[PDB]
Amino acid sequence: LGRKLLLRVNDIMHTGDEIPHVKKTASLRDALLEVTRKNLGMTVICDDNMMIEGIFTDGDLRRVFDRLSIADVMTPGGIRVRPGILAVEALNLMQSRHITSVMVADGDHLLGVLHMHDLL
Prior knowledge:
Strand order of the largest sheet: 1-2-3-4
Number of domains: 1
Oligomer: monomer
Number of strands: 7
CATH architecture: Roll
CATH topology: CBS-domain
CATH superfamily: CBS-domain
Shape: globular
Order of helices and strands: HEHEEHHEEHEE
Structural class: alpha/beta
Number of helices: 5
Strand content: 25-35%
């Protein structure tokens, strides 16, 4: 696990089909279907070229509770990490920000999503 903490996020993040993402035109309902589908408790909002527009977490749905599109309720932009950071560094950031998932990106280009549980 000590070894585990020195792995790079690149090698532990969900990629490809495992990434939850929807377009900013998506229904809230459709966005939620994607969140459920991929089991990470959040979805990215991005275009077909994987350029990041926002994020939406289960906590954000609670915050909404104060029929919409996902753009209407997302966090625009969003916290993210670079693929070369260490598992331990990612864990530290997530702890300090009190989050359990994070996007992995090169700038605004989405590469993957990491969950606290992956950090094992």
